[PDB]
Amino acid sequence: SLWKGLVGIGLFALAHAAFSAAQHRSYMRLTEKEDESLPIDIVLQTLLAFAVTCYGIVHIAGEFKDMDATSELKNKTFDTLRNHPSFYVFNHRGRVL
């Protein structure tokens, strides 16, 4: 179940990016520049977090299945089919034991 760890790592890194960017914004409003864009590093970090997280969530999302009924009948025999549990009766050899 490594894909779970992968997703948690993506999330942690993304949160780190958000924190870094908030404090950078504070720097901006403090130095009254309000002209410049974000440093590249934050951008790359968040984007890779996003991509990795999607690649992992696709895996852990589940698993597809055929829509042809007889696929799940390939392995089956009368012994299962015949029992009819709501019509059971016990007056048979086993009661000896």
Partner 1 sequence: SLAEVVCLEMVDLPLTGAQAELEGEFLLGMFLKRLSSQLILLQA
Ligand X SMILES: CCCCCCCC/C=C\CCCCCCCC(=O)OC[C@H](COP(=O)(O)OCC[N+](C)(C)C)OC(=O)CCCCCCC/C=C\CCCCCCCC
Contacts with ligand X, residue ranges (CB under 6 A)? 15, 18-19, 22
Count of chain residues binding partner 1 (CB under 8 A):
11
Q: How far is the CB of 10 from partner 1 (least distance, A)?
A: 18
How far is 55 from 7, CA to CA, in rounded Å? Answer: 9
Residue of 51, 1, 42 lying closest to 21 (CA atoms): 42
CA distance 76 to 78: 7
Nearer to ligand X (CB atom), residue 41 or residue 72: 41
Range 36-65, binding partner 1 (CB under 8 A): 39, 41
CB of 34: closest distance to partner 1 in angstroms? 15
Contact 19, 62 (CB under 8 A): no
Q: CA–CA separation, 37 vs 35, rounded Å? A: 7
Task: Write out the residues near partner 1 by the rule CB under 8 A.
Answer: 16, 19-20, 23-24, 26-27, 30-31, 39, 41
